[PDB]
Write an enzyme that holds these catalytic residues in place. Structure first.
Site, PDB file in Angstrom:
ATOM      1  N   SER A   1       0.790  -1.223   0.000  1.00 29.90           N
ATOM      2  CA  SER A   1       0.000   0.000   0.000  1.00 29.90           C
ATOM      3  C   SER A   1       0.826   1.279   0.000  1.00 29.90           C
ATOM      4  O   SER A   1       1.961   1.342   0.485  1.00 29.90           O
ATOM      5  CB  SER A   1      -0.931   0.045   1.210  1.00 29.90           C
ATOM      6  OG  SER A   1      -1.901  -0.973   1.166  1.00 29.90           O
TER       7      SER A   1
ATOM      8  N   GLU B   1     -30.034   5.878 -12.288  1.00 29.70           N
ATOM      9  CA  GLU B   1     -29.887   5.935 -10.835  1.00 29.70           C
ATOM     10  C   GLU B   1     -28.782   6.956 -10.558  1.00 29.70           C
ATOM     11  O   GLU B   1     -27.937   7.219 -11.413  1.00 29.70           O
ATOM     12  CB  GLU B   1     -29.483   4.573 -10.285  1.00 29.70           C
ATOM     13  CG  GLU B   1     -30.611   3.565 -10.297  1.00 29.70           C
ATOM     14  CD  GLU B   1     -31.573   3.772  -9.148  1.00 29.70           C
ATOM     15  OE1 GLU B   1     -31.727   4.934  -8.718  1.00 29.70           O
ATOM     16  OE2 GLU B   1     -32.176   2.776  -8.687  1.00 29.70           O
TER      17      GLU B   1
END
Ligand SMILES: CCCCCCCC/C=C\CCCCCCCC(=O)OC[C@H](COP(=O)(O)OCCN)OC(=O)CCCCCCC/C=C\CCCCCCCC
Ligand SMILES: CCCCCCCC/C=C\CCCCCCCC(=O)OC[C@H](COP(=O)(O)OCCN)OC(=O)CCCCCCC/C=C\CCCCCCCC
Ligand code: HEM
Ligand code: HEM
Ligand SMILES: CO/C=C(/C(=O)OC)c1ccccc1COc1nc2ccc(C)cc2nc1C(F)(F)F
Ligand SMILES: CCCCCCCCO[C@@H]1O[C@H](CO)[C@@H](O)[C@H](O)[C@H]1O
Ligand SMILES: CCCCCCCCO[C@@H]1O[C@H](CO)[C@@H](O)[C@H](O)[C@H]1O
Lengths: 101, 61, 146, 48, 380
Positions: free
Chosen positions: E206, E272
């Site tokens: 990460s 949506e």
């Protein structure tokens, strides 16, 4: 006049890494040139940088920063890596140009 | 000193800790459900079938 | 030995007047610290939960020979007397010690170790290339469940 | 249009209480574990 | 052999080397919690989807009613239906923050992890698209009709691909049954690719908010991030459930409670919330083909970000100029979203064309420019 100087010192302060005690060079993304540059650093400069970074990461995890007194000041920020980095890039370009023609 | 007692009897051995969680859940369910329905119904006095039910439950025709 | 976990290790029961430190110390290569610690804490948990009468029988014999070895010469016997009086307010003979030692059984070791080790927050000191050993939290979880 | 209306709200109520209770407990737990790092202190000791 | 069976076992070694002993930066913030949520969300969508698929009937004469039957007759069928439709939303809210985080903190420099991320986004969008058609209400039919009809604007291969995709001359039963199959399928591909996503990621490990090597301070994923991620879950889950159980129809279009009708075009055909911004950009360029291209690029542009990075620093943490530009971009997106829900009339039409124009400008021109400018202000 001193326009560029005012802007620079302004940005420097706006950036805020000095609040973590980081030097401008401590914030460079480690691409290939920087990777090489670092390998050329003298042991002491390397270890000092290492502690500064580990120190910032600990502050970052804590969501804290250094006390105003300890912030690196614009005119006291040592650009320790730039000399090496510029050379690493100097060599790479030479090789690159030489391998073309 | 319940914390102390609880720690020695319930939270010490992982075996008793799990056993505690189960009976804890069993008891907590029974209680949380009653209290929840009790709150819900009280908030809706006279609107549920449960309430108006007497009017037609053997009291008509 | 099987997994080349360390250059050496030792257990210690450093006593003081009112307190003490019961632990262990090991020296190992940077890349085997984790496994060693893992296996070590493992053995500690084995102590609190599954010690056998076979293991104790031998432990006692090793401890007997050890106490006798601390009385090999005048200087070491003098050291024992000096310390015994100073710490126990009198001298404890080999005849007494041995009695105490003979009283120990598996059941007892388990209960005593559980009392001082199980689910306790240890103290840790690490020096050198220790990157592979990590997180107090992980070390702490090693303090429970055989 | 929605026969579940009432049951849906009775559930929403239970969902909220349990949600509050759990989010709380897990917040403590998280903080408790991280305390080791949050309070941690460090120093640079070169042989200088 | 290995002492602990967590290091040696060909399977427990995997669960271990990616969720227990995995080295993670000691300082990743809550913006690093979305990856796990996205995952959990995915497992959740699949579970509720299977439960619904077991009571569904892919046929134009039974679709609308089979879903109604599920809500009305199936034990907790209404609840499972709610969680699925609203789960799709949660999924997108999570994915948009996941992306945002990545843009702000320069995670895209991990190119393969990033490019697979984009593919996941597209797959998820197609998945929700086909899934939306299943209940077969008015918006389900017209959304399907309007959107799939754009392909006929492609040259030559167009008018064909469309009638091939539909399986006929208009959106009809053959289209419905093939959409159920795709909707049932794509989610597994998502899971598949998600595995690839995490594999590339694990190569590098990460990134972190300061954008500097975290090698000097790594920590075991467990218990640090397992607890942090679980907490992050419950935190999000509370509003998801709250909105779901207390305002079920907040996000949905009422036009979908009316069985599809090919002879009655709804007044306002709109997607949506999660597709609105793209709808806005679609309608911004009047010309069937150019609008399609503009829509395509609105998402495919993500494949370019890695190449428009000019800063010498990885994140925006220390770049005040880029930060505001970044928030301008975010706000630029709420505007496109809003525009997407408004009819095609002044002032909306012009506000819309501007927002679109600014959107691509910010990503293709300003960002790379300001980065260069910033390097000079650091004297680099
Ligand atoms: C009512 C019905 C009654 C029956 C229910 C039976 C339930 C049985 C559950 C087994 C009990 C668990 C026992 C295992 C103990 C292991 C352990 O160490 O605890 C877990 C351990 C704690 O570590 P320590 O504090 O160090 O404990 C040391 C004690 N000496 O790990 C944890 O953090 C546990 C907390 C888990 C919380 C996760 C919840 C997050 C999710 C929320 C939403 C809810 C879930 C819905 C399910 C979805 C299914 C489709
Ligand atoms: C696309 C469709 C758009 C639909 C709408 C999406 C939802 C929009 C809601 C806006 C989000 C509100 C969040 C407010 C956060 C406020 C905040 O804390 O900002 C400052 C804070 C300061 O951090 P540092 O600079 O690292 O300093 C460290 C010192 N402690 O910045 C951050 O937290 C980093 C920003 C990451 C979050 C980004 C979320 C925005 C999401 C939008 C999607 C954007 C991407 C484009 C998608 C294209 C398809
Ligand atoms: C199916 C959807 C997705 C899933 C399941 C998923 C999952 C993950 C997981 C679990 C992580 C690690 C933890 C974290 O940082 O959040 C991660 C990291 C990352 N993902 Fe995704 N992701 C998804 C979609 C995407 C998308 C759409 C992008 C961007 C286009 C993307 C880009 C990244 C990148 C660049 C990282 C690196 C994070 C860092 O360390 O800075 N992912 N993702
Ligand atoms: C990435 C995961 C998925 C997403 C984003 C997703 C999304 C959607 C969407 C948006 C709808 C329409 C909801 C509505 O009624 O408004 C839907 C419906 C449906 N989905 Fe999924 N879905 C996913 C996975 C699945 C899976 C794995 C299955 C099948 C095993 C499934 C089965 C269904 C069924 C049966 C419907 C129709 C009934 C209904 O409308 O509620 N879905 N899905
Ligand atoms: C079957 O149609 C389903 C729609 C929907 O909102 O699904 C959740 C829908 C409903 C009404 C109007 C439009 C749509 C679908 O819209 C889109 N659907 C898209 C699906 C996939 C991709 C990659 C891009 C998409 N863009 C759009 C856009 F909004 F921009 F038009
Ligand atoms: C079993 O549970 C019951 O189910 C009913 C619906 O079936 C709800 O209305 C009740 O509130 C609930 O307690
Ligand atoms: C964050 C996770 C929250 C889970 C909350 C579980 C509460 C749901 O509980 C439900 O309540 C209904 C009404 O009384 C009953 O009819 C259902 O049988 C019961 O399962």
């Amino acid at each position: 006049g001193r326009l560029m100087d005012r802007i620079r010192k302004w940005y420097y302060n706006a950036a805020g890494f000095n609040k973590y005690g980081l030097m401008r060079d401590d914030t460079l993304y480690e691409d290939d040139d920087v990777k090489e540059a670092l390998k050329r650093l003298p042991e002491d400069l390397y270890n000092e940088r290492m502690f500064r970074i580990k120190r910032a990461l600990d502050l970052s995890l804590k969501h804290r920063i250094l006390p105003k007194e300890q912030w690196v000041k614009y005119e006291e920020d040592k650009p320790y890596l730039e000399p090496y980095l510029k050379e690493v890039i100097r060599e790479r370009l030479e090789r690159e140009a030489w391998n073309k023609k | 000193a319940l914390l102390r007692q609880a720690y020695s009897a319930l939270f010490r051995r992982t075996s008793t800790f799990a056993l505690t969680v189960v009976l804890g859940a069993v008891l907590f369910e029974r209680a949380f459900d009653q209290g929840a329905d009790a709150i819900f119904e009280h908030l809706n006095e006279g609107k549920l079938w449960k309430h108006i039910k007497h009017k037609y439950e053997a009291s008509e025709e | 030995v099987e997994h080349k976990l360390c250059h050496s290790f030792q257990t210690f029961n450093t006593s003081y007047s009112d307190t003490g430190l019961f632990g262990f110390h090991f020296v190992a290569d940077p890349l085997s610290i984790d496994d060693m610690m893992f296996c070590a804490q493992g053995e500690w948990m084995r102590l609190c939960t599954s010690t056998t009468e076979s293991e104790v029988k031998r432990a006692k014999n090793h401890l007997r020979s050890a106490m006798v070895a601390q009385l090999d010469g005048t200087t070491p016997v003098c050291e024992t007397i000096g310390s015994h009086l100073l710490n126990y307010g009198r001298r404890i003979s080999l005849e007494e010690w041995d009695s105490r030692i003979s009283a120990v059984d598996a059941r007892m070791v388990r209960d005593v170790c559980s009392k001082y080790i199980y689910d306790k927050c240890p103290a840790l000191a690490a020096v050198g290339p220790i990157e592979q050993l990590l997180d107090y939290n992980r070390i702490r979880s090693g303090m429970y469940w055989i | 249009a929605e026969p579940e209306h009432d049951q849906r709200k009775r559930m929403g109520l239970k969902m909220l209480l349990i949600s509050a209770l759990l989010t709380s407990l897990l917040y403590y737990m998280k903080r408790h574990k991280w305390s080791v790092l949050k309070s941690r202190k460090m120093a640079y000791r070169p042989p200088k | 052999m290995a002492p602990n069976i967590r290091k040696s076992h060909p399977l427990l070694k995997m669960i271990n080397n990616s969720l227990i002993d995995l080295p993670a930066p000691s300082n990743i913030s809550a913006w690093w919690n979305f990856g796990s949520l996205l995952a959990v969300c995915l497992m959740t969508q699949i579970l509720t989807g299977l439960l619904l698929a077991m009571h569904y009937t892919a046929d134009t004469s039974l679709a609308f009613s089979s879903v109604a039957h599920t809500c009305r007759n199936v034990q907790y069928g209404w609840l499972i239906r709610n969680l699925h439709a609203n789960g799709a939303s949660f999924f997108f809210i999570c994915i948009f923050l996941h992306i945002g985080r990545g843009l702000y903190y320069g995670s895209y420099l991990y190119k393969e992890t990033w490019n697979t991320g984009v593919i996941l986004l597209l797959t998820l969008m197609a998945t929700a698209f086909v899934g939306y058609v299943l209940p077969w209400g008015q918006m389900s039919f017209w959304g399907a009709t309007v959107i799939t009809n754009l392909f006929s604007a492609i040259p030559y291969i167009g008018h064909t691909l469309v009638e091939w995709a539909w399986g006929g001359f208009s959106v009809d039963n053959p289209t419905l049954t093939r959409f159920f199959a795709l909707h049932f399928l794509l989610p597994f591909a998502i899971a598949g690719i998600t595995i690839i996503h995490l594999t590339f990621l694990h190569e590098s490990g990460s990134n972190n908010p300061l954008g500097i090597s975290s090698d000097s301070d790594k920590i075991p994923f467990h218990p640090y991030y397992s607890f942090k991620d679980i907490l992050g879950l419950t935190l999000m889950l509370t509003p998801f459930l709250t909105l779901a159980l207390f305002s079920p129809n907040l996000l949905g279009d009422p036009e979908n409670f009316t069985p599809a009708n090919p002879l009655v075009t709804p007044p306002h055909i709109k997607p949506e919330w999660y597709f609105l911004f793209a709808y806005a950009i679609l309608r911004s360029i009047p010309n069937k083909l150019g609008g399609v291209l503009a829509l395509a690029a609105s998402v495919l542009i993500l494949f370019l970000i890695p190449f428009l990075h000019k800063s010498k620093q990885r994140t925006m943490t220390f770049r005040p100029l880029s930060q505001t530009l970044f928030w301008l971009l975010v706000a630029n997106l709420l505007i496109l979203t809003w525009i997407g829900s408004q009819p095609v009339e002044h002032p909306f039409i012009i506000i819309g064309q501007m927002a679109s124009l600014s959107y691509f400008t910010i990503l293709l021109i300003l960002f790379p420019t300001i980065g260069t400018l910033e390097n000079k202000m650091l004297n680099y």
